[PDB]
Amino acid sequence: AKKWVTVYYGVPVWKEATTTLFCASDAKAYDTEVHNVWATHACVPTDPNPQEIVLGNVTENFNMWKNNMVEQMHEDIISLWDQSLKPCVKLTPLCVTLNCLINCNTSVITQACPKVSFEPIPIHYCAPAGFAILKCNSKTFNGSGPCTNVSTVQCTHGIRPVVSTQLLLNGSLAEEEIVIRSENITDNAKTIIVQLNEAVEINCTRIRQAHCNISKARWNETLGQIVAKLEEQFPNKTIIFNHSSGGDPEIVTHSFNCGGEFFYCNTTPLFNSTWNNTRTDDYQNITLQCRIKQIINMWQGVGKAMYAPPIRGQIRCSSNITGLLLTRDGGRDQNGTETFRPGGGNMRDNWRSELYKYKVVKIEPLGIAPTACKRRV
């Protein structure tokens, strides 16, 4: 016949937006916790009854390394820390614009230091009226690959902003098997993330000395499973671990926070074992030395920070280990080997392991199509 353009309505279509999402936490508003205080000041209770729509045969290209949600939660967490742990001295630099001796002098800051309790609280992220959030359901997700079993929602699950390096503390587990994620293997430039499917207990207890214990009977099996999954990418070579290569104290050794104390712990007696298809580790309680600090290197920029003296004593911490961060060492001098050292420190990297599913979308109804009819004039 004869094709003629026409304008339709009500077509389903999606896009990508850059709106602002609000927090949502089941706060308490009665205790001294700074997280509770922040949640009470700016957050609202959770949805009494969530509603999830299970969409059908759709296929959308998910990408996690280029998401935009993280760039907002990472700026919200930093604001959160400005209400719990104020610094006695906040020493940061600032330069003066001069083409080139560029002016650069240290600036001093100080306020009150009242000791307060500190414990993370779950937080929910929701989208405003006019947008939706797609979430995937595939058991693997391939990293940054398309998946099919998608669903639509308005809010995320519970998220704990726990901060740490070289080891992922309390957090959600995998579906059925430990998985490895990386932006681009074979470039020895991007951090490798690993997610487990069964947490491993850790218990730290202690004036300037403390110990940490981890169940070896489970840790050996965890390493065995991780290595077994890992050989697939590099079958011929031999995988060997090794302690940190040096740098700032906040990255050479495990560092975390507990009860207003900044714990630093060496982690050498965990990566000295060269691994093969068989066992070469040993053959109870794995002791782990730790010493608290008062002059630390900030993670929100550059500059040292000092806090008030430590508490009297009797501080305990019990936590679960679910994820892991590992780096790689490549080169042409490699001779049938592959050394994997522990790394991390980029908080964005630590937080991408929790928002790698959700994607924020907007709906577009309009549409143009060629039809077989003709207008009456």
Place this chain on the structure above:
Amino acid sequence: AKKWVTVYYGVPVWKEATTTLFCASDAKAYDTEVHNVWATHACVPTDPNPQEIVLGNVTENFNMWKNNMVEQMHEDIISLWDQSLKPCVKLTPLCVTLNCLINCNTSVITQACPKVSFEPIPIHYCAPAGFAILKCNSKTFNGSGPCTNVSTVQCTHGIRPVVSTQLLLNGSLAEEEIVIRSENITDNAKTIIVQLNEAVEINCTRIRQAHCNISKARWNETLGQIVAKLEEQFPNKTIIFNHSSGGDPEIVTHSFNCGGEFFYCNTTPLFNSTWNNTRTDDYQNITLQCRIKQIINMWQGVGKAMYAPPIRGQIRCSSNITGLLLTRDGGRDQNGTETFRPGGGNMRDNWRSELYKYKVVKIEPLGIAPTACKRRV
């Protein structure tokens, strides 16, 4: 000429739905009253500015034995009692499905029974968004007959869900005369509701002995009016009153719930005396002997419910009388006599005494009609 079809939009229409309503009773939320506690827990503050509107020369068929709005208040008060008057043990049997000696074993439940106050408060039912209720204003209404003055509303009038038999507690009175209502007369099987336009007072006080007061000087007037009105229906008959014919202790003898006490008062010396066109009683303060009890056949299903025993004393109950349930005795041997005995037993009948004026209505706007129009084509 020639007839054609056409469609009009917006035509009012009456229909029947099966929606659900929400309790809204004046609450206090600060006192220890159980009704106020129930209202504050699951109810809403009453409507501040309800509106009643008058239709035109409308004529519909309000019904009383086919309304469903009673089945909601029944199951709401039943839930309220299970949370308000917590028994020490609420015994309720439960059988087993066996064809036939069928299996039927006793069932028991556990619950704490601390002494609690109980003073009934009205509840204002209201239909959800999208529907309405309708009520007439005829002073007689004939029962299930079409009225002529109709009004549309959302929330009913204050109703006390008090339970009792052979005598109604506080309740609305008639407008001009004492009225008599029934569903299908001439079968001596459907209870006759007699509504009074004057309140007969009563005061009963007192530990298994108590005394109730009846002022014959004020009861005689109401009795005479009721008997005179009854004479119209069966003038050829001679009206004779008597006492109950036997049955459950909660029906044959008057019962009430006052101050956590299950009063059973024997009102035989008020309905045995015969009546005629002239008085034949005597010629003041008739003493109604009463005995406190702890035995009740749960009106909300066959079972038992025994609470903690009574308080030491000092119990008063001052009540009004504005309604009554009376059935008539029929038979082939009726030789110019009309036996009138006390009635009651199904609290559904009492709940039909306050809901017969309201019917749930929905609206459908579309309509068709014939006309001489001819759409161009």
Place this chain on the structure above:
Amino acid sequence: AKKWVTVYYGVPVWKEATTTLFCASDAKAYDTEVHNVWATHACVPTDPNPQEIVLGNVTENFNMWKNNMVEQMHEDIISLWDQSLKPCVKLTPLCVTLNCLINCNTSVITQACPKVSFEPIPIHYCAPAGFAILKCNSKTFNGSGPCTNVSTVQCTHGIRPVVSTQLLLNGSLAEEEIVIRSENITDNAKTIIVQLNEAVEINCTRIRQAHCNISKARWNETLGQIVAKLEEQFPNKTIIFNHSSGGDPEIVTHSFNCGGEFFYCNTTPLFNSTWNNTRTDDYQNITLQCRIKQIINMWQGVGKAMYAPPIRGQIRCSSNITGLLLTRDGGRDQNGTETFRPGGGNMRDNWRSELYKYKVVKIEPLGIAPTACKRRV
């Protein structure tokens, strides 16, 4: 060619209405203040965030002395005064309809007199859903003359219901200079309002005696500026001031209240100085004698009233003067002079100097106009 009528939609047009308005004040709900209690019982919390759209070069005619908003506040304050300071004996005239010495008698009632505090609170007026409020921003406004820089609002600014005479108490200051408002000068009938730019201080403190103190070093300059503003209208004649000319004890002298303390303060040593281009007043403290009262004349009608005995002692008041109401005297015998005296008393006038910059409107969208298009038929 050939014009034809055509109807448009959405055209911007305004009008005036006579709708109602609800109080909007920031109450407390805990204090004993009667104003706070009344606001909590009937008022709403203040708006959390206002918005103002600045319109273009549009023009409007704001008439001030014929506005309808004043009566609403005047008849709303009367109720508030009827719930805070109750009189012990309320005496009012009462007549009977008789054409003529008509039947006229005095009816007296009583009420409880529990001593209670009293402090004026700011109040906001807001329009209901469907109407809008305009506002001018010119620095002079000429009184009842059109402005050019108008903008829309939704709730008026803070207002204080403080009631006094001959000296307007705490109130908003002018923009740049004192401004004079007068409905129609040269008729010696309408009260003349004057608004200042620099608030003046006053301190009045006290069994039946009290003293008031003022700051001369600022009052002299204020009076000089006021006379300089006045001289423009009257360049030829000579300005003069004088004490009140008599009447009721509530108009010949200043009168106000402090927490159940009704002060009738004389103000003769402030308006005696004859004035010309130069000063002739003096050359640190001006003292004003004050005597409390217990039998007063109501301001919301006709009739005397009585109150409870005065408080023990230690009564103080610090106040800011912002405006000034004056009367005037004409006459054919005037020999080139202008005498100005204190005024006030009509609460309508006392509130016409605070709502001169507001007006209510509703939008009428329909419009017609001629064009060159024609229909097909």
Place this chain on the structure above:
Amino acid sequence: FLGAAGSTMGAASMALTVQARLLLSGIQHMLQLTVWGIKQLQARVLAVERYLRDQQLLGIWGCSGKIICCTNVPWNDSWSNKTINEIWDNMTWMQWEKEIDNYTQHIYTLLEVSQIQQEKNEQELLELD
């Protein structure tokens, strides 16, 4: 709003014109009122939604965008068999609706088929012009 219940069809139609002309001619408190506000707003929002949905759905019959519509379907003589004047001067809307209840199902299919008929005829007419 189309008509006050009780009046006859003719009277209601006559009063509707005058009402429309006149209308378009330009001539205590407590904290717990919050819940009732929502309970009220919900009904209004639902009614607006339903009205708009029905107005848009009327596009199948060709009357979309209008309320007073008549189709080109001849009125058969096996449905009512009554004069127009009597119906339009008595037997208010409820009775008239209850009268034609039995057969009203088929008229919907007739209307749909006639609308499709006119639509197709329009498409064939498109070919010539």
Place this chain on the structure above:
Amino acid sequence: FLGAAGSTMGAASMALTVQARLLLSGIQHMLQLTVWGIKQLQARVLAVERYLRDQQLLGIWGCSGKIICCTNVPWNDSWSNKTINEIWDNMTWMQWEKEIDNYTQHIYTLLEVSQIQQEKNEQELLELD
């Protein structure tokens, strides 16, 4: 939503087209925020209801569901006696509305009679075909 007052008729009318083209081309917390939210919602609901009611009520004159309509009633020179250029180059909406407020009511009666006559003529042609 046709513009903002204070601007000439022609300028606002023209800017409306550009705005529509551009839009269509696709190019501190406290417990007392509950009340003002309901207040805001009520105004929007009322505005929607009024808009719908007026849009439906414009059906008498055959301009149903149209912001801009056309009529066939000649413009008598005894009303304003002005040229179509000066009307749209100056005299922002309010001034023009003020100028022609005396004859407004008569116009509605004239339009109603014209519409009824047009409908009757169309029905006569219908009887013809």
Place this chain on the structure above:
Amino acid sequence: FLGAAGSTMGAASMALTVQARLLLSGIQHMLQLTVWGIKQLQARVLAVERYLRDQQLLGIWGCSGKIICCTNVPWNDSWSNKTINEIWDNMTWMQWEKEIDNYTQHIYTLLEVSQIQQEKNEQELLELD
């Protein structure tokens, strides 16, 4: 809301009529939870507002007050080079939208010009009648 993504164009077009027929046939609280009711009502009100505004603004191309219009712009072959059945039975809506995303700016201007021409011709004829 017209359909669920993934389904082909023709299937959704066919099913929408049945959906309309069905829709026309009519066949643990935290006192801070009150905020969520407003959060839902605001979304619903905004949806209705946007629907009305878009429907009103769709009138430039002469397709106002409808959900499926037609225009008078011939369909070239350099845009898709595709036939009816393949488009209307395959190529889910998102894929088709992506396919012709380059020319999605010229067609708007072409359609607007065609509408202007049609309106001018119709007014020229109106001058005749």
